């Protein structure tokens, strides 16, 4: 099975989102559930992103102000600005990290049902707005090739 891109369908992106969120929550000891080198590379890339981010900025959750009524709009506003002038793998990693932060903060703030919603919002945004860019730019395979190496 080497003729086509790894994780080349929306169903695969969904799995990718669910595994990512499960991991981000597990790092905080919160248990939740709803391509293998792809999941591994994204874990690594997001962790390395977070490390760099935190060197320069305060905790990402310090500027969120989550409520159940405003969470979807907060998500959409942030992500729409993130990709307003374009897409690249670094911004896609930023997208996963932001979604993970939304989920962690939801559980922290005793709004844990929002996790399931955030996972759906991420999956939909990925499939509606990032997936065709991903296919046009070498698939998750290209991402693995570029971000596979540490740092």
């Amino acid at each position: 099975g080497s003729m086509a891109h790894a994780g080349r369908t929306g169903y695969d992106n969904r799995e990718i989102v669910m595994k990512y969120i499960h991991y981000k929550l597990s790092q905080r000891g919160y248990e939740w559930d709803a391509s293998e080198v792809v999941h591994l590379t994204l874990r690594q890339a997001g962790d390395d992103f977070s490390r760099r981010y935190r060197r320069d900025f305060a905790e990402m959750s310090s500027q969120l102000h989550l409520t159940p009524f405003t969470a979807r709009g907060r998500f959409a506003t942030v992500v729409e600005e993130l990709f307003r002038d374009g897409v690249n793998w670094g911004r896609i990693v930023a997208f996963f990290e932001f979604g993970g932060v939304m989920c962690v903060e939801s559980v922290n703030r005793e709004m844990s049902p929002l996790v399931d919603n955030i996972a759906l919002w991420m999956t939909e945004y990925l499939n509606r707005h990032l997936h065709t860019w991903i296919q046009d730019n070498g698939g998750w395979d290209a991402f693995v090739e570029l971000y596979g190496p540490s740092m």
Binding site: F57, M60, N88, G90, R91, A94
Partner: peptide, 21 residues
């Protein structure tokens, strides 16, 4: 705060992009 958050995500994202290449 939301605008600033997005900008922080975007630039850190762009940095990462550039380092990979």
């Amino acid at each position: 705060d939301m605008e600033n958050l997005s900008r922080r995500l975007k630039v850190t994202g762009d940095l990462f992009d550039i380092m990979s290449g």
